[model samples]
Target: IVGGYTCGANTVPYQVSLNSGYHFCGGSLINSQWVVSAAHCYKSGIQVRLGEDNINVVEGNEQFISASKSIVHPSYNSNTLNNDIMLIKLKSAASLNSRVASISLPTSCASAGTQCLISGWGNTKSSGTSYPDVLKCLKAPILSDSSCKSAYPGQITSNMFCAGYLEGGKDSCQGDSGGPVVCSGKLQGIVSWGSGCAQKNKPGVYTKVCNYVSWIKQTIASN
Candidate 1:
């Protein structure tokens, strides 16, 4: 993401270390106040880290955005992987400096076949190389309306927007869910799931930001 930004954005990658370990995934700056991630990652204990260039991650312009409260989309279903959206209410907004910044989240973002970006410490190649300590990002084309709709017969519900290579070069694995999926600088989707994480014929799926237009607006209003 270093090359993507001109050094004035608010959004940064979020990493958390617990008894288990650490994770590097995509995140966005909703306002100076909050960063957006997936609801599933709102596990037992976690801290959202911002404005860091690498996951070797030693206090690199880091600010711990503590989620005083978290709101998961009422439509989420872990088993079916539906309605996969959430919000993290930070204790305070991030500080803009030489290091930290937030991202953009528009109400009902992205259009059909719009170009977008995805970032994280995810694998550079399927099962070949994984992001060890630093953050990584890549270009993701918008899902074609016809293909997204045809993922399965009458599948691809309106609430979800699909992306990823039909051949599966890039993908979001177990830990990458909740990361931001954007198009034209708009918060178009939230990383949700894919078939087997990186299997061919199964692209990554995300929560459509457009479908949740009311929710984003309400979230900003209430919290």
Candidate 2:
């Protein structure tokens, strides 16, 4: 993530790298066979790499899984970025280990101003040209719907929320979509979309995970 520092390799056990041919996106393990990510992050031939920190090197703890199916939200709008979330059903369930595990989903909203941790393998610089070999993380405060509305003005919806600073020094950037925005040790949000890379007053936008928890469970059961 932009304006973030290097995170510990095993700090986020649920974090996964979404790799296609030559692109990198981020994801989180929700269950043994399911992964959660931004709808916009999904594409054909994508796979998830769990228990990975450095993208350039293969580790013994890493578990690679092929995507059996990708289910994007039917109401997801790429243009408006509404409901920008998706689920990936793995060909086989991921094995839990010290370096790999599933994250707990939120049952309710996190209080506004709660400090949350966002981790990803996105661009480290604003230019979006550079990518980190290892995962990076940043702590940001959650913005209220009112505050986020003031910033985005008629765009922020109930399905989404905001985090980051008014001064805008930290945020998720390119290749970080679908990463986890964790609060209170639970999965709270997903790095969905934003205006730009760490722009002033333009906090990073995220999919409100609590808002879609029911949908997630229903989808998993039906699928």
Candidate 3:
């Protein structure tokens, strides 16, 4: 995450790194067997590492599990990046502990100016290719729908919202897609897309998680 600080070990226990050969995206564990991420990060075979802080270190606390299934939202639009959320079912349930736990999903939508924490192993800069070896987190305030619309000009949908500084410097960048945007200890958003990673008047766009609570619950119950 751009303009963020390294997170303490296992501080964000629900955070997970999505991997194929290497870490490519981030995700939030919502239950023992379910993870929430961005649909755009979907892949045939995915390995999830929970309780991870630094990617370069083994970190014995880590729990590595393969994804059994990845279900993207039915109405997800790639071009517009609307409804860009996905649910990943793990092959086995994750062991809940201090080092590996799930986060609660938001019951209601977050209003503008709600301070949230965004965490990831994404790039630290807006124009370069430097990814953090350890997890990084930043505090950002939710932007109002009107402010979001003004920033993107007709691109802001109800399924998506913006968060970050309007002057730039902080945001979720490449490799951070599918990460968590937590508000009040509840999952609020999923890192999805943006104009240019923390540019002026162009905050990071996220998949609004509250809108998918019913779908998420129903899918889990039926599956």
Candidate 4:
């Protein structure tokens, strides 16, 4: 989390953690066999952990799965971070239960002023020693495209959207990439990139999920 507070256990069952060697990135279960995240979160030896809030210890409901394959967007640009989304096909389908599920994806864009949420185990501050073991959450309100563009200058693009406090006290920090940005009960975005954690006038930037729904659907269908 970036400027986030501890969240309730089992509150976000769709959320998952990716362990790439020592690196940790947040992700969401898009289906029984597919987990969605940021393309930039890709790394070797990655494993997916679900239905657990705490990372340090294994919980009763914890389900660990290996990735059968990791698919990065074909047009993903590492430097500019364009099309920064990915899908992880699990080696086996996840067991459906009260503690393990998938989030809904949207067919349309999220409106401005919509209140959404971002959750992760990222650093509390921009520069910190280590992230917490438990998951954290922060309330983020969708900002206008024009406002976000002005704040980001040339960095903001149609494929992205902004959400956070203008005063800059809440955001998705480093290590939180590939997490879900749930808005109006739908997965509207994925944590992609940002200037810093809770920096003034610089909100967290997310890959607009609505813009890539078609690609996501096609990818899943063909995979």
Candidate 5:
């Protein structure tokens, strides 16, 4: 992922590169001091670039954190892909100004019928992985437990949330995982998994934000 898209940029958004920088994924600003993203993206010598929309990486709007202090939610398992969440603490807080923005964490999240936003320079169609440098979004409605069950059967666990085309077409592919699913201008979900990127009867799965409210508060508050 990084290899294909990590060309010189005027400004590059935060990213975690894996496999000695062979692959990379997006990161979201929780504050000037921290970022939230998927655990699977971590790798040695990961670089966090701020406000990376353009990627020339020198638009007077860049900060690179050479070593992320730690990636929170450290108990994740890559095999089953359970507990896919993670947080990164920058070596120092980023300077706050017009170019940088703080992301909002949800004060409340709905269990069903919730709509949210997912954005990334990821694959728009399920056919491939990642994208050149464009970020796109689809208004996704949260799936009901029964609807989710019908599509994924027994695989839909209480810890997860699902959204996207019921017929399974529009979705965030490889690079969008761990990027946020925002509801009512607040972070409400984390991209988790799906049978296919956007397959019929299959919605994009996410980590249910409502179930982890207390933990989210504690996690963010502790630091």
Candidate 6:
């Protein structure tokens, strides 16, 4: 994440690295067997690394599990990035501990101005390549729908919302996609897309996790 600080070990137990030999996307462990991530991160043979703090070094607390199935939202529009959420069923249940656990889903939608935490192993710079070896986190407040629409101009949907500074600096960037945006200890959003990393008037946009609660539970129940 741009303009963020390194996260302490085990501070974000729900955070997971989506890897295919390398860290590509971040995701949240929602349950023992399910993970919530962005639809755009989907690919066959994905390996989910749980309890990972640093991407480069072995923390020993990490658990590597392959994705058994991945389901992208039926209405996901790649061009518009609407409904950009996805769920991954793990090949086996993740063992829970202090460094590995599931995060709770939000019971309600986050209002505008709610301060949330976005964490990932994404780029730390907006213009160049710089992926942090350790997980980084930034505190960002949710912007109003109208404000977000003004920034993107008719691109903001009910399923999407922006969070970060209008002045730019702090945001979730590339490799952070599919990561968690936790508000009040609940999963409120998922890192999805943005115009540019930490650019002025172009905050990081996220999938509205509250809007997909029912869909998540139903998909898990029937699958």
Q: Each candidate's lDDT (Cα)?
A: 0.62, 0.90, 0.93, 0.88, 0.64, 0.94
Superposed Cα deviation of residue 116, candidate 4 (Å): 0.4
What is candidate 2's lDDT per residue for 1-223, written digit by digit as tens?
8889989888889999988855478999999999999999878998789998888888668888999999999999989899999999999999998789999999888989999999998988875478888889999999988889999998988889999988977889988999999999889999988888898989999999999999999999999
Off by over 4 Å in 2: none
Residue by residue across 22-41, what tens digits does model 1's lDDT show? 66345566666666666666
Task: Report the C-alpha lDDT of model 5 over 15-119, residue by residue, as the tens digit.
Answer: 322213432566667677877777776665666766555443245665666545555465577765666677777777887665566667767666577776676
Which sections of candidate 3 miss by over 4 Å?
Answer: none
Q: Give the residue spans of candidate 5 off by over 4 A.
A: 1-23, 56-60, 72-74, 220-223
Instruction: Give the TM-score of each candidate.
Output: 0.81, 0.97, 0.98, 0.97, 0.80, 0.98
Kindly report which residue pairs in candidate 4 clash with one another: 1-122
lDDT of 3 at 149: 93
Error of 6 at 143 (Å): 0.8
Question: Which model, 5 or 6, shows the larger lDDT?
Answer: 6
Best by lDDT: 6
Task: Report the Cα lDDT for candidate 3.
Answer: 0.93
Q: Cα lDDT of model 1 overall? A: 0.62
**For candidate 4, which ten residues in a row score worst on lDDT?**
124-133
